[PDB]
Amino acid sequence: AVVKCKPTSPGRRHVVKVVNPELHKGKPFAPLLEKNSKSGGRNNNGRITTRHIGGGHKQAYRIVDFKRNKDGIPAVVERLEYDPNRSANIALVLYKDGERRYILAPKGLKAGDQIQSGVDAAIKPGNTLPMRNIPVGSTVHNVEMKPGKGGQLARSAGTYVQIVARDGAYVTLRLRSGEMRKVEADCRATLGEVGNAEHMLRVLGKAGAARWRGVRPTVRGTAMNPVDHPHGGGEGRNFGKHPVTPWGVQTKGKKTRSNKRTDKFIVRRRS
Amino acid sequence: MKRTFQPSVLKRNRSHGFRARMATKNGRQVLARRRAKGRARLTVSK
RNA sequence: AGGACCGAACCGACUAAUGUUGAAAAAUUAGCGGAUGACUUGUGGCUGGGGGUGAAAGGCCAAUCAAACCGGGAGAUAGCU
RNA sequence: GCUCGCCGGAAGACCAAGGGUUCCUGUCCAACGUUAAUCGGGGCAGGGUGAGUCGACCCCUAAGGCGAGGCCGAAAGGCGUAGUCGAUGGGAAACAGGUUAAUAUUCCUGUACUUGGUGUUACUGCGAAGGGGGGACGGAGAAGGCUAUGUUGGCCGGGCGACGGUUGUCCCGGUUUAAGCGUGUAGGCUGGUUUUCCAGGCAAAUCCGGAAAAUCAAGGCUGAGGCGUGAUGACGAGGCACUACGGUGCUGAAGCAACAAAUGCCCUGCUUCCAGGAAAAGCCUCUAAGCAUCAGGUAACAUCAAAUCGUACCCCAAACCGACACAGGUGGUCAGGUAGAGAAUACCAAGGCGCUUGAGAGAACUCGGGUGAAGGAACUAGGCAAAAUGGUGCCGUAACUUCGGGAGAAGGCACGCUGAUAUGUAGGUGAGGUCCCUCGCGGAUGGAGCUGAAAUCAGUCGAAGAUACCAGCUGGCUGCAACUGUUUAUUAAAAACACAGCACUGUGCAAACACGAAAGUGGACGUAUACGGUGUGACGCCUGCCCGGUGCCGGAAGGUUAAU
RNA sequence: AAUUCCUUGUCGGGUAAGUUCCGACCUGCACGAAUGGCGUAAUGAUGGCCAGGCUGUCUCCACCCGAGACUCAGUGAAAU
């Protein structure tokens, strides 16, 4: 539900917010939270490596279940909940044997619906089963890459991966970037597109709205002095360069994929 | 105005103390220099 | 409700006068901006010198910063005084 | 010693950090105090800091450090597993009165509570490094119950006023009492119970979780305050002995009620929001090998034990950081009266000080202020500086506008005091009495008192009634930047930087990119609706033509082209 | 024109008088479309101009109140 905020203040003039009323209005399931603290982009050396990371709000990490190796046991969905560690809401599923778990909420999966992993699962959104069984053309998500490694693809909010051709022991599926990629056929996958497909329609509206997420200011390279950035100073607004990263390497076109031992799986690169 | 030496004995000790000198090699070298010079106050403690 | 409005604590530093062998190696006096936030603060910690950090001023890194301080090469070199 | 003045959300009081004897008494005035000094935070001598409950030490962990084996590295060393440290966080327990020249939640008096050890009596399935619960956690807002505290009245003790009056609808002072134990209230949450069954909690579980029945519907947890007890005590205006004159021993009255009321307690609550808001132990519980008369556990009783370190003193400052007895800096707690929306402001209480050179004079000239004839920006780079507006209520309010704004636009009228309505109204609180009663911290009626605006009508004083302090100057045209913000600590606060939004581009996850010789870490416990980089910079109408050049991407027939 | 040299461009407003300001023109030394163009309500200790009110800023200074300056007693510097 996209709501344009009435333009009372100048910081609320341009805010468009997403209010899914069916999320949980309460606290999470405590036995699946874990301490998740911040870094600011500073590794064990101490020095900043990733820039524009720091501060924001404090968050606790919800252990979300990506493998879904509980085969044969059906599961109800207790509730949908916000997750701030992620972009897609999480469902709290309860199996028959009492065990509760956290899964990614696929499109149109509301509370009280049976989900079930396993090679025997019925074809519907929610069911995690290997790609040996799912037909060709079936929109899947939360794809694995190695058998037994957990979901890695189609994990964001509203993104779905399509299966287009199974050959031998591999399946060539079309990623979200239009790339084609062959994964072997034991890798599990869930059915449906991930939920909350309008994580893209919202507008932050102000600068604080972004600093709330640990998104520090992004200084233009062309402001800094020639020692601090290749784009450097110069009286007036002066560029005359060829665009580069703060470290010399070309940007605005130069390719950087240089990994060969995984190229034998890629069929057709992105657009 | 607010000056630069705003003391604390916790920080003083945990920064320039003895238990923090003899942890690295350069610390024991500092103490070696001082023991050789003959300085009566080897460290900042006490 | 709100990076909303007026305004003390709190955070700052736009103007003017005094001061400038000062009370002060950056302050005082009369006004001044923010004041539920991208705010402020106490305690402890991490990043180290061609390096840090930098809402970007070549700013800040112990009253020192276009490459800190201390020790050493070192009684550097000086067609200059 | 008697006046005068100054602070009183401090210039009062208690700490933390820091200092280390500056604390208290005697003695000295050479040196230090911007002067003298008999004085001192100075010199010399002596004295002073008392803890089972306060704080450390101690148990547990965060960011983080160190880190046996280990992986990596010319050596030195780097990262990091088990572990082990690390508060700025979680964990047991004390209050009131008195006393000292200087310590008191430490000493004394009265009354308490907590944790363990050992021994007896009785009942008995106890036991982890393991499982489960709990600890356990955000912003904002709203008012329901209260308290601290304050005011007024009643009661007690005293007074009858240097100058008109003052036996009263008069004046001054007091009217204080805790921890703990008991009761279990306003409010908050919550279904309970007995059994059967189980792909989960690595194994087991009598516990958590899930399922199926019956089964009653009121149980349970939490919880400020009040009331009783603590307390026939303690404290109390005192009067009152001289005893070494400092007060020492003595007795010691009243010791209640209404109202107002928190930023404090219920409240770690309730509602709502998106930005989704620490960990582990202590505590209860379940079992594992293990032991099952024993051990051990539970309860009462008896005794023992609680060690060690800090305690003086300043702490918005003459004692800490500023070379100084420096107009500067420093975090927390307590927060009285009258006006007041107020922690502003002005006057004051408790309390603390008059700023460690004075005395004259009353020149120019400089600093900080007051007032000004007539004119009113004529000054000047420029209305810089100063003057002026300043509050509450009612009416009224332009082009433009993103429909929020603009807007406190602009601009008009009223304001004191006394009386009446109303010997104090509306409203708040609500006794006594009656009635119910599930008999108490209950409910209903009733309205006693206490508190108490705002308005209208009339009258009256001043030149002036928001009378002091405090407290917008306003309007038109325009450039730049959308806006809130950040920046050159110490001459630049802006049109610069940031920003939400837009595009390009890279990135398929052992991601690109970065710090690293490497291990490895950040990106991220994230997965193209995601992440890095680059430019532009809300919103609206849009973003034209050129691929020659230098880059980037794709092609590669042919030519040149290194090591070998 | 934060861009214009000649330039105080030419015309109109505002002024008794206007190099600055506002609105047109267009001979753009030397604007121009994301090193973005044009327009833009609100916002600004932002740059420019104007007007009301107000005033010792001024014509033009005068008096008065305090701190120094001045005289006495004590201590007692500095640059050169």
Curated annotation (Swiss-Prot), chain A:
One of the primary rRNA binding proteins. Located near the base of the L1 stalk, it is probably also mobile. Required for association of the 30S and 50S subunits to form the 70S ribosome, for tRNA binding and peptide bond formation. It has been suggested to have peptidyltransferase activity; this is highly controversial. In the E.coli 70S ribosome in the initiation state it has been modeled to make several contacts with the 16S rRNA (forming bridge B7b, PubMed:12809609); these contacts are broken in the model with bound EF-G. Residues 27-52, 220-271 are annotated as: Disordered. PROSITE patterns: RIBOSOMAL_L2. GO terms for biological process: cytoplasmic translation; negative regulation of DNA-templated DNA replication initiation; ribosomal large subunit assembly. Transmembrane segments: none annotated. GO terms for molecular function: RNA binding; rRNA binding; structural constituent of ribosome; transferase activity; zinc ion binding. This protein can be partially replaced in vivo by its H.marismortui (HmaL2) or human (L8, from the 60S cytoplasmic ribosome) homolog. Keywords: Acetylation, Ribonucleoprotein, Ribosomal protein, RNA-binding, rRNA-binding. PANTHER family: LARGE RIBOSOMAL SUBUNIT PROTEIN UL2M, RIBOSOMAL PROTEIN L2. Belongs to the universal ribosomal protein uL2 family. The modification N6-acetyllysine is found at K241. Pfam families: Ribosomal_L2, Ribosomal_L2_C. Part of the 50S ribosomal subunit. Forms a bridge to the 30S subunit in the 70S ribosome, contacting the 16S rRNA. Interacts weakly with S6 in one of the 3.5 A resolved structures. In pull-down experiments interacts with CedA. Residues 38-47 have a biased composition (Low complexity). InterPro entries: NA-bd_OB-fold, Rib_uL2_dom2, Ribosomal_uL2, Ribosomal_uL2_bac/org-type, Ribosomal_uL2_C, Ribosomal_uL2_CS, Ribosomal_uL2_dom3, Ribosomal_uL2_RNA-bd_dom. This is Large ribosomal subunit protein uL2. One of its GO terms (cellular component) is cytoplasm.
UniProtKB/Swiss-Prot annotation, chain B:
The keyword rRNA processing does not apply. InterPro entries: Ribosomal_bL34, Ribosomal_bL34_CS. Coiled coil: none annotated. Keywords: Ribonucleoprotein, Ribosomal protein. GO terms for biological process: cytoplasmic translation. It comes from the Bacteria. Pfam families: Ribosomal_L34. One of its GO terms (molecular function) is structural constituent of ribosome. One of its GO terms (cellular component) is cytoplasm. Part of the 50S ribosomal subunit. Belongs to the bacterial ribosomal protein bL34 family. This is Large ribosomal subunit protein bL34. It comes from Escherichia coli (strain K12).
